Structures are given as structure tokens and as C-alpha cells.
Write a protein that binds this DNA or RNA. Sequence first.
RNA 1: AACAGUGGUAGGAGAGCGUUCUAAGGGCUGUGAAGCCAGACCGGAAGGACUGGUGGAGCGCUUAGAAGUGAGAAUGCCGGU
RNA 2: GACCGAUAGUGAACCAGUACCGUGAGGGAAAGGUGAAAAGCACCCCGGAAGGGGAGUGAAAGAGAUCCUGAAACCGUGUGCCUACAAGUAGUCAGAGCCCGUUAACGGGUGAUGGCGUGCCUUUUGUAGAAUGAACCGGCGAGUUACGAUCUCGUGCAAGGUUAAGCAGAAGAUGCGGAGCCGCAGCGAAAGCGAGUCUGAAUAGGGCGCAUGAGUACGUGGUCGUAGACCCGAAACCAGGUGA
RNA 3: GGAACGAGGUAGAUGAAGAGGUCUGGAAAGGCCCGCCAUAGGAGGUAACAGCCCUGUAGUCAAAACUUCGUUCUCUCCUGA
Lengths: 205, 117, 146
Amino acid sequence: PKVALYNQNGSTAGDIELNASVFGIEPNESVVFDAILMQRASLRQGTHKVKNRSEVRGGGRKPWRQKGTGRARQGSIRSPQWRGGGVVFGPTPRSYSYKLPKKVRRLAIKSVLSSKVIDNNIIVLEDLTLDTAKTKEMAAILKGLSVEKKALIVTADANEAVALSARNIPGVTVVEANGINVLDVVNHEKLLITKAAVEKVEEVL
Amino acid sequence: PRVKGGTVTRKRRKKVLKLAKGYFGSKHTLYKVANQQVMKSGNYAFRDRRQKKRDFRKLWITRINAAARMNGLSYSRLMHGLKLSGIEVNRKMLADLAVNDLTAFNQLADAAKAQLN
Amino acid sequence: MKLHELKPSEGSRKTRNRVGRGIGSGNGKTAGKGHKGQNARSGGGVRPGFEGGQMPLFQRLPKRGFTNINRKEYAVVNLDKLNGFAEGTEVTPELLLETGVISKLNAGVKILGNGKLEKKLTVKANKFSASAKEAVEAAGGTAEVI
RNA sequence: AACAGUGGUAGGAGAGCGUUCUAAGGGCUGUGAAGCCAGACCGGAAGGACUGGUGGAGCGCUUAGAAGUGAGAAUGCCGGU
RNA sequence: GACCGAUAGUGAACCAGUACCGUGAGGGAAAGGUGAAAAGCACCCCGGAAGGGGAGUGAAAGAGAUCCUGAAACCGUGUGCCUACAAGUAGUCAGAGCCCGUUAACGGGUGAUGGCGUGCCUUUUGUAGAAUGAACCGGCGAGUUACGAUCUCGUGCAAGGUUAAGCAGAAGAUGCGGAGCCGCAGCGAAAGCGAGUCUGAAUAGGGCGCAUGAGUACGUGGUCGUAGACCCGAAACCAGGUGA
RNA sequence: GGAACGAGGUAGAUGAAGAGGUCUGGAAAGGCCCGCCAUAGGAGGUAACAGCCCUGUAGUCAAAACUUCGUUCUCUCCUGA
């Protein structure tokens, strides 16, 4: 699909027809849902542990005899019912990640970045050169393109001026063309991208 | 994560305790006995809701019997005569109202006496 | 999607079944085990194959046969799946291998006929005679048996 | 709309209420947050309001997601009376 | 850190392996919070002092030294309605008289008198039981996780599905790695034959099979197996030490 | 066994921009109306919730003296068909 064309701040009338196979397919919500759930897990550590009944620093002898005196029969003073005993079951260290077949991943990324096109939430640029690494310049450029909320910025050449700037602005995020995944695309509203990165993205998949 | 949870227990018990106001002694103060009393009271209320319908008709019948005996009849003969004559579909409740405010009760009595022969 | 308007596919998730939490749900006091069947009795119960004490069916029937060390299994290819290579062409185990017709090449390739055949090709299979003597003629010759 | 049905233990199947944490977004509090205490409100239940007092700094909503997930009894453990 | 938040987390947030117990080896606790700042109550009165009532500081003194908030059992003071002829699992249904006025509703409190009515849990063929358990109040206290089987549902791809270790990448997503695994052909102990095979001179028969074609990767649920495996509860056995 | 260079460890240095006006309050970091800095919106304090109030952060620099590596030179060691 063709989607206009802009310059660092110039209207630069134009358009770039994008690979339909990549920017026109019908989205699968039932795939984006589990892609999101999988990606959100595997971000957690899972470093938690409780003391067992046998790990509590304590006693093995029994507090008193089983007959002669009227009292409930009791073994260790570190049983789950005593105050200061072990935790039955409870949190244990483990892993939370898992894997999906590759074609599902390809479908999910395609669907998300093709549904972005429907809502006119894609801006394609050219060049994107910064003379210096000032944060004022990036804010002026962003205002010049009517960007208010969060906004992803995708390049291809691993710019250092673009990465250094806009890394203090509390809404923007800069990534390489290879680093695109589902979460930041669906969590950033607007999506800036360079045509040079467009070619790489639509040539990998 | 760990879950503490105390306010839920306090609220759930205070509801029952507020429902058991007016009971004798410790039955309005301690949770365990108040709970049992509340459950028993529910059972009793159901049973007595049926029984009150059972017991109002008896009083109705007794008052009709007295008023009819004042006229020279019995309850059974009066009822047979009323059902036999002109199908008076008046129940017993309005019959008692007409008894306690009579001189209209008597007219129905002679209406039945006419057909009893 | 939007991260707040998130909804799963219908019928793919079920909620767990927590057991032993009150009497109004079923599984209330005894947790669905009744008054125990010796396995719901603390400890585990009985061994799976245990039949309460009886000469087991598995320990009764005799055990027969001996395994063979030099057992040779070939890769089976029927006539029908061979019918995708057009006319002419050469058929060799490697060519079948890097196409997906056969997934592995243990021992050798043994083509035996069960379906239909058209076109004319050349077949080079280990087998013993390139066919179970019913696809040799089906292949109308051209059967390199090596 | 018309007919039919609705006692229930062991047990099978279904639909729901509350708690803690996480993600989205959205919004509330020193002109008074949470907690606590009353009342003559609402819902078929599990529950949820509103108003007043106390308190003196926090807390909720919607849609998902995780679980140390709900107590009246174990001659249960600890504290107070 | 989708870990704890003072009965939790180390036995120990505090002069803790301390105090206590034991001849000894050894066992082993309880105990956090004034206020932003001591500005920590000069002076007067009662009292031997402790403790109060004023006056002052402070936003607060009901904040005044175990000094944030402060529930329940438990103990008291005042008051509206009942009670000294009555046989009661203590309530529920009917009902005068008296005292009040609400989240205004066929309202609130107390109740002379009439009818009905043998607590709760557990376990048994069967319990009001003279069968078991609990003095009361508050807190804590029991179906989990890992790895394998099997079934249903939702996906992805299908006669083809699917990479492991490893290498780059914020402890991430992902990219590349085709070793390996499960299916598409079966029968026989095997040599071996093949939609045919095995016994059988054969032909009749096979738990046979085709005819008559759906599996595979991942996810949520239901069961099973191995690990303490749902929570508590013995007498005994072995190994190393301490004591006339 | 020595002699020179380089990168570290054990202490530190420098480091941008609001007393903005106004309201309520015991006290503004809060509300409303306006501005600036950013390779620096990581944290903790201050009489309430602070990128511009304080200690700081991103970047740049640092060692008399002990130490950890690396490179080079010196320096030793006589054959294969």
C-alpha cells in the first residue's frame, strides 16, 4: 500500500507502495494475543523461595511423650501448624518461558505491522540526519510532524546521533531494523520508519 | 505473592452479629452461638409462614360457628345450605366480618334456612 | 489490538478447579475422594499392575521369539508418490532424499507398487530388484537395481 | 408464544462473587487517602452502596495476566481475658 | 526481582547463639513506630510521694515517655420499656399497652398473653444422645511443583509437521543451526515377502492388514506414574559421640 | 634475571536550567495561569507528590605509594636429511 512520504520536516510530496504481502494481509487477533502473552512472560526472573519443613533451623527431637499427659500428639516443633514452622508447598524457583513455531511468529509480526497501516499510524521518512546530538532538535522535529504520545523510531544504519538524542525524552524509543518485535510496535501508537529500513524489513520476511 | 486477608473475615462475622440483636445473654455477643441461632430462626420462619395460613382459618370457622348457633343452626348445616342455595361464593373471612358487624349476617342465614327445606 | 481491549480466542482457556474450599461447590469436605479407596488413603494405594493378588495376565501368557541383530529396514516409496517427477528425468536415492519424499535413508530405498503410474523415467533403487516384482513391469523396465 | 418440569448424601457437569500482585488506561485524595465505628439502602445467593463520626496519608476503575486464594471444629500452635 | 513486610522474612530488624534449662554432649526464646523541630509542661493549687486541676509550647496534650491508628472477648457508670403464682434448646408466628421519629418506607424500640418447636460437627444400618470434639475472643493452619504417558478444546501447518545443544543479541523478543524425533504399509520368532502376508500338499482360517486416508508443533483444562506428593500422628533399626 | 610504554584496582575533581505569579494550608514538592535545561526526567532527602532547593546523575578527567595484566627490548638455550 502507498502511504505518502515526508522529509526531516518537508512535506516532500510523494508515496511508497509497500509490499502487500507484508502490509496488506488480514490480521489474526487470535495469534497476536498469544504472541503478546508469550513475549510478556520470559521477562520475569522468578527468583523466589520459602523454607521447607526440613530446611528450617530447628529440632528433630519430639517435645513430649505420646501418653500419660493430656495433650495433642506432636512431633517436631517445626511442623506446619506450629508458630515458626515450615511452609507446606509455597513459591519455588523455576522458569516461565516457552516457544512457538516459526510460521506463527511470522504471521504475528506481519499482522501487527499491517494492522498499523489501517489506522494511518505509519509515517515513512527519508535520510533522517542529525548534525549534532542535541535534545532540542529532536523535540522540534517531533513537534513538526504532529507527534504527541509515544512513538517508535526505526532506522537501519545504527545511528548514534539519533540514539543519543531522544533517549531522554520520556516517550520515544529508538531501535534498529532487526530489533522490531510485537510489544513495542503495539505499545507505541505512532510508528516512524525510514525507507532504507522499510526495504530491510520487507526483505527479511 | 502472599495474601494476608483480615478485613473480609471481620466484615463477614459482623454481619451475623448485627443480625442477632435482641437475643438473651451471650447469644447476641459471641459469633459461634449467634450463627447457630440465626440458622434455626430461618428454618422456623419458613415453617411458621406455612402454619399461619393453617391457623387463621380455624379462628374464622369458630366465629362463624358461634354466630350461626345464635340463630338456631350449626356450622355444617349452614355451610351446606349456603352452598346448596344460589351458590354464595363468599368465603369465611368476609363471613366473619359480616358476623362482627351483623344484621347482614342474619339475612344470609334465612336465605340458607329457606333452601334447607 | 490495544493492550486494554485484549480478548482471547473463544473456548481456549478454562479456569482451574480448586478443591476443598467450602461445601457449596461440591468437593467440599472430602475433596472428591469419598471415604477413600485405599489410594485416597494416605500413602498412595496399590501398584498399577497389582490386581489385589492373582497370577497376572502378563505373568501368565508365555513370551516367545528372539530379536535379530542384523535386521534391515528400507525406506518405502509407493508408485503413486513417484508420479510427480514428470517425463524423462532420473530417480536416485539422493534426489528423493533432498525433496521430502523420504525423510531418512536407513539401509536402502525399496519401491513397491500400490498405486498408479504414468510417464516414463529411470529408477535406481537399492531394493533387491527395484520393486516387489509388481512394480518392475509397472515401471516398464528402466529399473537400475543398484 | 404454547406445552412440560424444578426434594436430595457419595459423585459428574455448568455459571458466578470476593482477595493479593502484574500489564494497559483513567482518576481520586490534606478543602482529607487507607483503616476503624454506627445507621430506618440495593441485589436470587455468594455480595455491593450511601450518609454521619474517627483518622491524618494514601487509594480506587475497565480489560487482560499470575497465585503462599476465602476458616467454626485437627485432646491444632501463639497471645489476651 | 508479577520475593517478605514485624505470629512474615535468617533462630536473631532491638547489646542473640544473648536470657534461661542441663554434670555434660546439647536445646533455645520474647522484645519495631512521640513530634517537622524537645519547642520534653517556668509558674499556682491539693497531696509525705505517686498522681491530678489550671496556666503555658504545639497544627494537634483525647500527642505527655511501651507517647501513629487503635477491633473483639472482659470490666463498669447513667437511662426509655418490661419483671416477685412462675416449668422454659431461649427462638419463630399472632398480639394489646407505652416511648420515639427514618437512606418515608403497607416506619423504629420494648414487649403482658396464645400456637409450634429435643444445639453444631464427626461416624454409622441407625444418635436429642448417657457415642467423639470444642472455656471464650483474635491471628496462623491442608490437593503444589518438576519430568514422562493419555484424552477433549483452541490454534499453526498439513501427507509433512517440527529443530536440540550451540553462536550473536539489554538475564529479553528474534536470527541461523537440518544432527535428531513422530507420521505416510503391513504380516511373521526370524531369514524374508509386500496389499499382501503367517500357519498349511493344499483351502479354510487368522489378535491380521488394505479395501474404507490425517497427522504434527505449541497452549489451557481432566486423569495416571516417579519424587515426602494432601496435612498432622507410633513402637522400633543403624552410625558417630557424652556421662560412676 | 633486568628496562621501558599502555590499560586497570586501592581516596577523589568538575558538572545545565524557576525564590515565576496566584489559592488553600502549621508547613507547597499540590491546584490554576506562565517559563526554561537535557549525551543529565537513575535515586535519596527537604515541615505534603520536585528534571530546574540540597547530595547527586550523563559526560569528561585524575595517583606520591603499593599492586594486576599486556607489548617490546635486553637476556639465556646448537642442528635437521
